[PDB]
Symmetry: D2
Subunit: 125 residues, 4 copies
């Protein structure tokens, strides 16, 4: 399994998405851990032109706080959907902006696990 700090991200993201009204525009929450120990959250902004996924809003929120490197991140869907693997675009942005980051996804056993971003983007660009 994952460490307690990483497990805290799941709780924080879950709390964030479940604390707001059900919406088709804001349906996913994300939480990331910075190298200094702070946690940053955010929800997605859906739009056909490429509204940011929750993870990208988190990256912007962390940057606004001069958080520096982010070490772990997770996305939680609304309506008790739980952990959601980051989409291809988010994986690319994470790899390019925080190459040392790990994302929390569900393994074959459906259990939470933190994986290096490069593993989610083999032969990545």
């Amino acid at each position: 399994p994952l460490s307690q700090e990483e497990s805290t991200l799941i709780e924080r993201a879950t709390a964030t998405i479940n604390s707001i009204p059900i919406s088709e525009d804001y349906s996913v929450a994300s939480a990331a851990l910075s190298s200094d120990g702070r946690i940053f959250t955010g929800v997605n902004v859906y739009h056909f032109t490429g509204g940011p996924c929750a993870e990208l809003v988190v990256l912007g929120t962390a940057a606004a706080a001069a958080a520096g490197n982010l070490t772990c991140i997770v996305a939680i869907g609304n309506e008790n959907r739980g952990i959601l693997s980051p989409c291809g675009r988010c994986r690319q942005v994470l790899l390019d902006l925080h190459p040392g980051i790990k994302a929390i996804v569900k393994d074959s056993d459906g259990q939470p696990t933190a994986v290096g971003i490069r593993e989610l983007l083999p032969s990545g660009y």
Copy 2:
């Protein structure tokens, strides 16, 4: 010509971008005001796949706090660039998600002014 609240937005966004390390990835900050009086900030996340502009990070931050309708927004560039009009993509997202919002831009005389989002997208899609 701006209200007290609007001037505060400019100050908040300016302080945000000036407070972080100069970066090519995080170079613009934005601040928005919600109908309930709360202010939300954020900085952009640059990426060729369409990393969110500061305004979009602000929309997700506001949504994460269940801010509801946003009434005004502004973007401030790093290196003392001052007010920057929202780009075309942000105008579209703002129009679609917060149709009653205004954006602070510089008028033909270089003076800050709050304009209805529809005015920034004539014959908008």
Copy 3:
């Protein structure tokens, strides 16, 4: 008051969208005119991460043919919707890559009219 070539763009985009199966992923066609006289077409690719609008596929198609500067562009929707004004994102990309381009939109009387891209993005970023 559209030129012969401008009206031809409308015909070409209309023919394109009426030549493919009705789809929720590919619902808009676009056609643009190059200064060298050639016409390029395209259809959008819908995706939440920001799949390109028909106009952007056209820009990439024109680029692949070494078209150079485009002078006019139009978007035609399926379901017999007719002319669609470019969305905010397309306006920004068009302004940044083809600043002298015009986009065909509907005037107050619902008739086709070519408008400078700068007019579609007042006080543009």
Copy 4:
């Protein structure tokens, strides 16, 4: 090794990017094969709001021709850079719109090989 159609795609994409002026806006070409016997090309349209990668332009070009299903795709960088693996966003769009497609990438030996899109996006969204 690569099949005949796979080597042909590389040649077509390579010829495409090498046939246009060197540009920072149009720097990658892509080519895809459709199940109905056609090959579609395209070049990227760089833009901070998420201008489409060459692969997305190809998808819209194929869609405009009512191509249906794309079975293989490849991207070639300008300035003799050769094969470029699809970025994360492209992998997501490809997986969602053409789940049965294969993408040509370089293996650990620098040797080109066609791989199922799902393989490039482990535990995708």
